[PDB]
Design a protein around this nucleic acid. Structure first.
Ligand SMILES: [Mg+2]
Ligand SMILES: [Mg+2]
Ligand SMILES: [Mg+2]
Ligand SMILES: [Mg+2]
Ligand SMILES: [Mg+2]
Ligand SMILES: [Mg+2]
Ligand SMILES: [Mg+2]
Ligand SMILES: [Mg+2]
Ligand SMILES: [Mg+2]
Ligand SMILES: [Mg+2]
Ligand SMILES: [Mg+2]
Ligand SMILES: [Mg+2]
Ligand SMILES: [Mg+2]
Ligand SMILES: [Mg+2]
Ligand SMILES: [Mg+2]
Ligand SMILES: [Mg+2]
Ligand SMILES: [Mg+2]
Ligand SMILES: [Mg+2]
Ligand SMILES: [Mg+2]
Lengths: 129, 88
RNA sequence: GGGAGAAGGCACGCUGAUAUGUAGGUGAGGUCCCUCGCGGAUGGAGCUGAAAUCAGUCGAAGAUACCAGCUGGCUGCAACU
RNA sequence: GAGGGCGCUUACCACUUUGUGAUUCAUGACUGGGGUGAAGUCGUAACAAGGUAACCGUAGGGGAACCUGCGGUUGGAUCA
RNA sequence: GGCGUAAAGCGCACGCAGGCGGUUUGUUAAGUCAGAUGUGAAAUCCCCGGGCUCAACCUGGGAACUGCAUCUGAUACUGGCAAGCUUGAGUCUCGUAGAGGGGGGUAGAAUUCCAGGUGUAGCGGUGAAAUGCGUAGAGAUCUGGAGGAAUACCGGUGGCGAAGGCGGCCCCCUGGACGAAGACUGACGCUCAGGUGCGAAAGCGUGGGGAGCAAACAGGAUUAGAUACCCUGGUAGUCCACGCCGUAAACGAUGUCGACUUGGAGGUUGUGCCCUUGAGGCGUGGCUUCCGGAGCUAACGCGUUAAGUCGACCGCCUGGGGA
RNA sequence: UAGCUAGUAGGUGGGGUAACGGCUCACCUAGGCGACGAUCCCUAGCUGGUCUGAGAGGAUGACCAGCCACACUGGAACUG
């Protein structure tokens, strides 16, 4: 069933990028809303919308550069079947610092660089490059 | 399977009015009725394994409503098994 | 179901106490119900009474006599009474 | 006279003993398969349509590979 | 790391434990994260050093001992509590298609046998044969009869079932499946070790049944042989009841559920709209077949019904023989 | 190896103990352990650390240092 909506978000992205789709849309959620935001700020997507009210529909506008998709890889890390938590001194960095990892912290979800500057750990949602 | 009158009668008897057609109590009475009716059917035939697999689906589904019912609200579950005479 | 009493072991008399005879069992007078007799709750008097356990005692020996299984293993044949 | 000690007496218990089990290592006439060789005898089941398509499960037969029945699969050739 | 074919998806299901879990507010702060204090012997290891001529060696201070326990805090995540939420799931209404199941009834073709008629010397079988059957009159043909099994045509990569599997027609009871609107319950969901059930054929118990087919068995042939392939016969068994057995290449050799990703031509079954302006036409749902794109793959291939791209749970694999 | 279990596990009290407790004793309760592996069997001293390894692990526990245990075999007190 849909027991992991996070992989679903990631996966809809991963496949739509692979399919040169201009955009993708999925059922929304606050945690998802926090991820579209981090992605925009790190220059991985154009923009997003949460259009809908009762059955909120989330929308990500994808991004392409040269014949390449801006998103080279995006994979789920922690997962309902095997949660991954790190402190601060164990925070992974992606692509040797290229790209980002999305982490959920005590003061919310942000990228590893941000969480690092604030000296905290949390549940590491994914890697992105 | 079940006749429109016997379902309409149960829907009246156990739901918050005539249209509460999906309440838990409603579902379990409807399941119970067909389960007990089929007691007659399967006493005879009995080699009707295919129909029984359909019956076990009704039973196991009835327990899941009762377990669901039992938690979210307890007086309604208790009242309900007494009213249908199951559980020992 | 059996085999099985398999096989093989600890007990055993006697005496006081726990209780001068306990549990039980039998069941009086009192009493009250009686639609009242060959009737009935209440009643626990008296009667009777096995084992059990704690402690003693005795002879060589306490199931002391009569009485009352020998037990085990390989195998022929036949099912069995 | 207290009290001690003593000796005896009960309890507990080691050494040891009797019946009966269960478990392990070794061994055993005879015996079932199994493996390996020297390239023996017998055949020739499978591989090609392997000269009766092949196999699975099953049951019977048969010096042997196997033959034969029932069902199933194609991992069967040939399909103007 | 893997399991379509190399070793590997249980034959299929329901399902307790168990692991997993949609979305909004609130709370809580267990898991989590941040700060500290205590602890984690020293030696060792490492860092920077000192020391014996160097170096092993010895040593000084720091690192580190990533662990634990408590304590003050953080609330995004996960969890526990409460209130919900309708888009997952389930119920109700009207309907559609179907060899889905169980039982009863019935129908017409056929083969076998018994009775009878006519009729004459062969039938039958094979590569050829012979066994066998026939002048006690077979076979061929007509008639009447008995009995069992199976249901031609339709019949189709057609349909249904969870697999096994299920086809003449009628009824009775009965399970699942899909569509259309609409209403209802309001996370009731996913998966399953154990367990529980189902489970072709052959086999087995008991009692019935017995036409046809047919292991065994027997004969005639073929053959160097011929325990066979072919031929003439033939018993179990195939059939029914009830009960076992629990296995198959039980196969798509592909576990189950949900999400996402270019396309083409069909078959099948719903239903909206359309002038059915006439077989047709365009839409929207269910199942299915074939070809293929990216990607995947060792290749063969798979290819929206994945072997693509993720996600929760299970089963199982670890060289060959031996087994 | 899938059940193990009567001082067995809990209770009231007497004793006992340097000290709590089935430590022990009578007396009530009928519980206790275990699929998160109880018992059973085979084996073994435990750690700091050692060898390997980028690492995670894997192997391992002479010399050194920390705890337990033994003292010809089994049983027992005795002194302090
Ligand atoms: Mg129906
Ligand atoms: Mg005799
Ligand atoms: Mg051959
Ligand atoms: Mg052949
Ligand atoms: Mg065959
Ligand atoms: Mg491998
Ligand atoms: Mg294979
Ligand atoms: Mg399968
Ligand atoms: Mg240290
Ligand atoms: Mg120096
Ligand atoms: Mg929460
Ligand atoms: Mg039979
Ligand atoms: Mg024959
Ligand atoms: Mg098998
Ligand atoms: Mg293709
Ligand atoms: Mg005490
Ligand atoms: Mg030792
Ligand atoms: Mg390595
Ligand atoms: Mg000693």
């Amino acid at each position: 069933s849909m027991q992991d909506p996070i992989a679903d978000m990631l996966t809809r992205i991963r496949n739509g990028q692979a399919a040169n789709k201009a955009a993708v849309t999925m059922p929304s959620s606050k945690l998802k809303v926090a991820i579209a935001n981090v992605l925009k700020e790190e220059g991985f997507i154009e923009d997003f919308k949460v259009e809908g009210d009762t059955k909120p529909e989330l929308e990500l506008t994808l991004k392409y550069f040269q014949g390449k998709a801006v998103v080279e890889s995006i994979q789920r890390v922690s997962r309902p079947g095997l949660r991954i938590y790190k402190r601060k001194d164990e925070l992974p960095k992606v692509m040797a610092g290229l790209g980002i990892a999305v982490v959920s912290t005590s003061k919310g979800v942000m990228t590893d660089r941000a969480a690092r500057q604030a000296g905290l750990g949390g549940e590491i949602i994914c890697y992105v490059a | 399977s079940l006749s429109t009158e016997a379902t309409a009668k149960i829907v009246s008897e156990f739901g918050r009015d005539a249209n509460d057609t999906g309440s838990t109590e409603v579902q379990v009475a409807l399941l119970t009725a067909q389960i007990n009716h089929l007691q007659g059917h399967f006493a005879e035939h009995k080699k009707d394994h295919h129909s029984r697999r359909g019956l076990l689906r009704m039973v196991s589904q009835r327990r899941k409503l009762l377990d669901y019912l039992k938690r979210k609200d307890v007086a309604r579950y208790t009242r309900l098994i007494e009213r249908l005479g199951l559980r020992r």
